[PDB]
């Protein structure tokens, strides 16, 4: 049906690859199987090599490199890709260890990005960018500061963009009258070789004056619309500079991204809750 072909200026060497978004099932990473198409004159003695990379930039800290030689040799999709090509069609087969940093980049390249590089030379160029990605498989926080503040989330797993609902319970016995309630979202993006980032904040001047109870639900939504101008914002894997989502929530060595909900009063005791922000499997 659909398969991606890449070539260099001379085009003697072509790489056919089925997918370009590798799903980490957390036990078996979708194996990387591709086909190299060459000619005899352009190679003759020089063998055909291909490489998988996990290049981390910001510094080029490739946490892993493996070499598989298309020619000489050392799967059905490979079968069908080969049958159309003939003698100079040679498979390469890389297997990603399950424990690699997923594909995350930083909006100004930087971050984590896999890659398949295909070349031909005598002794161990086509640049095919791939990525690692994951699919989406009841938070409750308390604080007795008086000012009893309880927050709860309907569910922990929310897809990118879907609104998140927060139940707030404010019991105020005190004489200290509230000014605001802010339900904010914090995106922690730790660069490992953990910075707070405000992405959404539904502030309402809901004041619960002495000896009172406040019980209502807020709905907050972190979106890239207002986050376009946030330096260090962890975006998801960018293929050839497409437009990407927010760096999803890692499910555990590169950049570690987590997401929490913070319910802050301005009196100002608060709470914090985590949630998952990964796309669902289509």
């Amino acid at each position: 049906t659909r398969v991606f072909k890449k070539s260099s200026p001379n085009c003697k060497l072509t790489v056919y690859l089925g997918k370009r978004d590798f799903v980490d099932h957390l036990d078996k990473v979708d194996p990387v199987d591709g086909v190299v198409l060459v000619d005899p004159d352009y190679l003759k003695d020089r063998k055909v090599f291909v490489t998988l990379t996990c290049a981390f930039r910001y510094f080029r800290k490739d946490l892993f490199i493996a070499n598989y030689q298309a020619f000489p040799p050392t799967t059905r999709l490979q079968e069908r890709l080969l049958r159309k090509l003939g003698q100079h069609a040679h498979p390469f087969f890389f297997t990603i260890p399950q424990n690699l940093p997923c594909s995350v980049t930083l909006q100004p390249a930087c971050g984590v990005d896999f890659e398949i590089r295909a070349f031909c030379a005598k002794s161990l160029s086509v640049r095919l960018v791939i990525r690692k990605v994951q699919f989406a498989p009841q938070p409750s926080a308390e604080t007795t500061r008086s000012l009893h503040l309880e927050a709860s989330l309907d569910k922990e797993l929310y897809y990118h963009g879907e609104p998140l609902n927060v139940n707030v319970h404010v019991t105020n016995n005190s004489t200290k009258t509230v000014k605001k309630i802010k339900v904010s979202v914090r995106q922690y993006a730790d660069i490992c070789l953990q910075y707070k980032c405000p992405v959404a904040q539904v502030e309402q001047d809901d004041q619960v004056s002495p000896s009172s109870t406040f019980c209502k639900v807020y709905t907050i939504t972190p979106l890239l619309s207002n986050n376009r101008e946030k330096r260090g914002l962890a975006l998801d894997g960018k293929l050839k500079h497409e437009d990407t989502n927010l760096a999803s929530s890692t499910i555990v060595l590169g950049i570690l991204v987590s997401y929490r909900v913070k319910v802050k009063l301005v009196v100002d005791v608060s709470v914090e809750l985590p949630f998952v922000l990964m796309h669902p499997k289509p």
């Binding site: 699919f135 437009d243 289509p282």
Partner: peptide, 11 residues
């Protein structure tokens, strides 16, 4: 915008 295979298609 689903069914790119993984996530959103922006183009």
């Amino acid at each position: 915008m689903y069914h790119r295979g993984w996530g959103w298609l922006s183009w």
